[PDB]
Amino acid sequence: MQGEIIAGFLAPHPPHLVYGENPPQNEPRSQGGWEVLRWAYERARERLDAMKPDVLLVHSPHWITSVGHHFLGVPELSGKSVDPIFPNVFRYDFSLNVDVELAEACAEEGRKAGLVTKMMRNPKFRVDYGTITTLHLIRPQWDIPVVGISANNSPYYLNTKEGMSEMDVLGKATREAIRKTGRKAVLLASNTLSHWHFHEEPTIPEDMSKEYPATMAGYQWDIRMIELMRQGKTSEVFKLLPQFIDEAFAEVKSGAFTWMHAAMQYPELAAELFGYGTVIGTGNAVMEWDLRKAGLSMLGAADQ
Amino acid sequence: MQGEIIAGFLAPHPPHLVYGENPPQNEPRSQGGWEVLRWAYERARERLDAMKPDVLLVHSPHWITSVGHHFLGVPELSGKSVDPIFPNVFRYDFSLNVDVELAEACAEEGRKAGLVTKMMRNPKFRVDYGTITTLHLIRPQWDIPVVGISANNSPYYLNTKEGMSEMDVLGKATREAIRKTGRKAVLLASNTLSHWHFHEEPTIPEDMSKEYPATMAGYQWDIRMIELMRQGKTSEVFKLLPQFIDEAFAEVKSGAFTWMHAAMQYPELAAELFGYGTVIGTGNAVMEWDLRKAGLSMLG
Amino acid sequence: TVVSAFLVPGTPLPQLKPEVPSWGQLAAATERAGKALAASRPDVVLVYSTQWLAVLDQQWLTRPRSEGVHVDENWYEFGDLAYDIRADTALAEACVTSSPLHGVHARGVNYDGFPIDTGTITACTLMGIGTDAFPLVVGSNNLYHSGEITEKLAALAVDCAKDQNKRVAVVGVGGLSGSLFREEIDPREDRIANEEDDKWNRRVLKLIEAGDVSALREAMPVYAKEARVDMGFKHLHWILGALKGKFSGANVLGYGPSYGSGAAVIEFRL
Amino acid sequence: TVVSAFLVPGTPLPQLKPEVPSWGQLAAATERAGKALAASRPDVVLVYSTQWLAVLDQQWLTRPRSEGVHVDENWYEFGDLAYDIRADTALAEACVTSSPLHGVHARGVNYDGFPIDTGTITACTLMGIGTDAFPLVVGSNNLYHSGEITEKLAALAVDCAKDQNKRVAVVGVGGLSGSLFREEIDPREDRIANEEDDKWNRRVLKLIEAGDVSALREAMPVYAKEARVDMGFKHLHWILGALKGKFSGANVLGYGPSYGSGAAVIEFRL
């Protein structure tokens, strides 16, 4: 048996997207909204639907930890996710399943590689809103086991460089765990790009005539950066990441983008852009790196 | 024999799109712009490239005619297309080739169908900035012959009802023409959706932080409309067209999107959305109706 | 400041196929207006053409010299319309400047190859204007401006000419009733489409010969709608505006058909 | 109007595992601060917590009764924090409204399930507040607010209370030096991470006891920066704003570590 990284997705977690879909799980009802980013997500949705993965691993910037990198560790987790910033658009009742053995294998490998890792064993833990938003946006059926990873403080407490360096080590430990387990998994980097925004509630939030890039500059970085990606110039986007982080206040500083790619070994592979758009001025790009198609998916023989 | 209409796709003519691309033929230069619509056309481009059509047929709202429906009729046409509203963004040098043989079959077939038609034989004639813009968006190579059709007055001079009727007939005549010529063609409906708009650029036309739907209501009309074509509920979008045109001032009135489907016999086929974006508040969507990969492209 | 005013047809038919009696008459009459214009010795010509369409900012031709060969989107079979239009950039640029000061955002248009409309071209050709002796200051027909706003653009412009101490001849280019035939006809049989449009064209025309500005302003809107008058007759509002809504008499030098639509050459008596 | 003031840690460690000596001592001090609170007989408790984050406009808690069980995303291994927090809707809502008046856009947050932060919860539990007798008026820590604006927000609240004739106990929830260990330790040997943080904590802590507002005022920004104090020590600014930059002195009921970070319980002598 071989372990595999079917693909890597840049899966932004804007709560507004689920709000405009009006799913059963979400309490507030909308008049619709953000259909571009939503349609963009319909694409990713079907791609994943075809993939039939064993598990979905997700790195969420809204589960902040100081002592190492944490991994969801209980079989089942449920709750009502209310977005603290956007309570009027996201109050989601969920219940999901965690691939604990893979989750533990990742912690294992991370520690082995020099990182401090922990297993979240409190069954009453409320999975963060970021994680729930992405999982819903990329897989509303909730039929895929998952492995939730915390976003360690390093990039902020220390500095972008040392932080990224840890995300990198996390990523290869993550790849190592996938194969040793023999899992066919998908990777979701729950990050947005330019994060400058509007500091105002637009009355009726779904008014798309009031939705646009917060700053021309931010919009520019976003376009520039994704162009490189769809151009397979992976090494060039990462050399630009630090400047992108600073000038655009891009959410990739949290580390999911670097963790996803480190696990994928920074493929100089062309990425597919399902779509781009803003939300509260924030730039969001829903993209994919199909490793199965590029023949870079298999990791190697599993253990046992 | 075996005339075929491979696919037909809604392909808007926003010059801002070519401007942001900075092609060799466009004189003014930008710092980019409208990437979302560009990427959407990029998808459309690939599709067309893999289509390998004999000819591209296009109907443009910017070649307005009072007396019947005209058709480009000289083999080689070229010139410098300068957008009159956006000359600071679109000044394009072009040179194209016309499939005169087919353009004539369309016209004759239109005549026999009860419509008045006319071939444009003047070699000095300057092709539309809209026709040129649309042609450039799906085929920057300028290597496929085309048949440029004019948008007859009927929708505006008479009314939407009697006007669309003419377009419908035109569409059917167009189909009959393709089928008799044995041509393997692709249709191009050059129409924007919602057409309410702003009033002048922010000095930097490409400043995307200033691009967004002109009106909430217009946006929703577009969304509702394109979503319906995606569901393949074609007959349903055509029931709403008049209301759509009325309420959102949709350019679909400005000639035909009706000609295309009429040519394709209004297939209840799910349309593929490449992307939806706003240009000056105006709603633009790039979609496709792949008849080949639907088993509806052959005419026999 | 203003020394002459004229309303001439925008249809290219008179210039293109004068051998057709009724069309040649219009051409000849437009030529006679040109002669009158020259005798008034203007320094500039304030033109507004029904076919020069603006959608955003008001537009003013600011390019020194424009030349080319225009082919009508509709009448391309009757021949070409070559032109060498010269503009008074100083006056035109002053109008671009004064416009926003009267509530109208406007800009100048100076681009090699910019599409000057058919009406403006045939007017220059037949009338002998747009020359260095008679440069033009052209103001676009913004589809969103009302008649009133059209008059404000014209008055606005007339003031700029006063400040530049220049003699202005004004010319509004456009047709009358617009019931354009919708099928091919023998040009030798052209005629106004209806008896209704004819009666209407004749009625307001007589009102113009009387200078009854008061009554004219009353009929204008009703007339525009019922006789499908070319672009709401805004090209007439152009003349009125530039003359401050007042003038006496007028001489209709020609009135005939243009593929169903009505067209005429009016010489105003300030 | 203000009858009491305290500063308490936002960490849940003292509450969750008091059997760990220094944590237990910190817990008992917080409890004592709670008794002093009640002894002051307040009608409302004006609370600001460093862990209640806002990034758009200012948030004020307006739900009458919020209850549930909260698990810390960092300290989950140490237990659950159950709560039944009561708010003074009338006063809170009055603060929502007065906010823009003082240049701060704000809103109320009243949603079943809303994420009350860990600091606000442990404070309510250990201090005995957030009860129907000691209702809360909690104002968010907006990431874009300076210490200055924080003071403006709290003075603005004390203002509304005086209007509604309510005695106010003010409580700032947050830590001191913020250098949390970045690896797992034996809780029993928890300690201040750096001697620099310990010294800095003792230093400003001394100033507070002394009531040396001026010196404390100027040391704050440097301290916050150098000892990585929890959210710029804005929870102290909140105390100051409520007291209008004036207080006689203070009694530090406890000072101990919380996974390397500094934490303390302060009772202010107005």
UniProtKB/Swiss-Prot annotation, chain A:
Disulfide bonds: none annotated. Component of the 2-aminophenol 1,6-dioxygenase (APD) complex that catalyzes the ring fission of 2-aminophenol to produce 2-aminomuconic semialdehyde. CnbCb seems to be the catalytic subunit of the complex. Also active on other substrates such as 2-amino-5-chlorophenol (68% activity), protocatechuate (33% activity) and catechol (5% activity). Changing residue 195 to Q: Loss of enzyme activity. Belongs to the LigB/MhpB extradiol dioxygenase family. It catalyses: 2-aminophenol + O2 = 2-aminomuconate 6-semialdehyde; 2-amino-5-chlorophenol + O2 = 2-amino-5-chloromuconate 6-semialdehyde. The gene is cnbCb. This is 2-aminophenol 1,6-dioxygenase subunit beta. GO terms for biological process: catabolic process. Not active on 4-methylcatechol, 4-chlorocatechol, 2,4-dihydroxybenzoate, o-nitrophenol, p-nitrophenol or 4-nitrocatechol. Binds 2 Fe(2+) ions per APD complex. The iron ions are bound to the beta subunit. Its cofactor is Fe(2+). Complete loss of activity in the presence of Ni(2+), Co(2+), Cd(2+), Zn(2+) and hydrogen peroxide, however activity with hydrogen peroxide partially restored upon addition of excess ascorbate. Partially inhibited by Fe(2+), Mg(2+), Ca(2+), Mn(2+), Cu(2+) and also by EDTA, at 2 mM concentration. Total activity inhibited in the presence of catechol or 4-nitrocatechol but completely restored after removal of catechol and addition of 2 mM Fe(2+) and 5 mM ascorbate. The APD complex is a heterotetramer of 2 alpha (CnbCa) and 2 beta (CnbCb) subunits. Keywords: Aromatic hydrocarbons catabolism, Dioxygenase, Iron, Metal-binding, Oxidoreductase, Plasmid. Fe cation binds at residues 13, 62, 251. Its EC number is 1.13.11.74, 1.13.11.76. Pfam families: LigB.
Curated annotation (Swiss-Prot), chain B:
Pathway: Xenobiotic degradation; nitrobenzene degradation; Xenobiotic degradation; 4-chloronitrobenzene degradation. Its EC number is 1.13.11.74, 1.13.11.76. Its cofactor is Fe(2+). It comes from the Bacteria. It holds the Pfam family LigB. GO terms for molecular function: ferrous iron binding; oxidoreductase activity, acting on single donors with incorporation of molecular oxygen, incorporation of two atoms of oxygen. It catalyses: 2-aminophenol + O2 = 2-aminomuconate 6-semialdehyde; 2-amino-5-chlorophenol + O2 = 2-amino-5-chloromuconate 6-semialdehyde. Complete loss of activity in the presence of Ni(2+), Co(2+), Cd(2+), Zn(2+) and hydrogen peroxide, however activity with hydrogen peroxide partially restored upon addition of excess ascorbate. Partially inhibited by Fe(2+), Mg(2+), Ca(2+), Mn(2+), Cu(2+) and also by EDTA, at 2 mM concentration. Total activity inhibited in the presence of catechol or 4-nitrocatechol but completely restored after removal of catechol and addition of 2 mM Fe(2+) and 5 mM ascorbate. GO terms for biological process: catabolic process. Changing residue 195 to Q: Loss of enzyme activity. Fe cation binds at residues 13, 62, 251. It is an enzyme of class 1 (oxidoreductase). Keywords: Aromatic hydrocarbons catabolism, Dioxygenase, Iron, Metal-binding, Oxidoreductase, Plasmid. Binds 2 Fe(2+) ions per APD complex. The iron ions are bound to the beta subunit. InterPro entries: 2A5CPDO_B (IPR034943), Xdiol_dOase_suB (IPR004183). Component of the 2-aminophenol 1,6-dioxygenase (APD) complex that catalyzes the ring fission of 2-aminophenol to produce 2-aminomuconic semialdehyde. CnbCb seems to be the catalytic subunit of the complex. Also active on other substrates such as 2-amino-5-chlorophenol (68% activity), protocatechuate (33% activity) and catechol (5% activity). Belongs to the LigB/MhpB extradiol dioxygenase family. The APD complex is a heterotetramer of 2 alpha (CnbCa) and 2 beta (CnbCb) subunits.
UniProtKB/Swiss-Prot annotation, chains C, D:
InterPro entries: Xdiol_dOase_suB (IPR004183). Pathway: Xenobiotic degradation; nitrobenzene degradation; Xenobiotic degradation; 4-chloronitrobenzene degradation. Pfam families: LigB. One of its GO terms (biological process) is catabolic process. Keywords: Aromatic hydrocarbons catabolism, Plasmid. It comes from the Bacteria. GO terms for molecular function: ferrous iron binding; oxidoreductase activity, acting on single donors with incorporation of molecular oxygen, incorporation of two atoms of oxygen. CDD domains: 2A5CPDO_A. SUPFAM superfamilies: LigB-like (SSF53213). Component of the 2-aminophenol 1,6-dioxygenase (APD) complex that catalyzes the ring fission of 2-aminophenol to produce 2-aminomuconic semialdehyde. CnbCa may have a role in the stability of the complex. The complex is also active on other substrates such as 2-amino-5-chlorophenol (68% activity), protocatechuate (33% activity) and catechol (5% activity). Belongs to the LigB/MhpB extradiol dioxygenase family. The APD complex is a heterotetramer of 2 alpha (CnbCa) and 2 beta (CnbCb) subunits. Not active on 4-methylcatechol, 4-chlorocatechol, 2,4-dihydroxybenzoate, o-nitrophenol, p-nitrophenol or 4-nitrocatechol. This is 2-aminophenol 1,6-dioxygenase subunit alpha. It comes from Comamonas testosteroni. The gene is cnbCa.
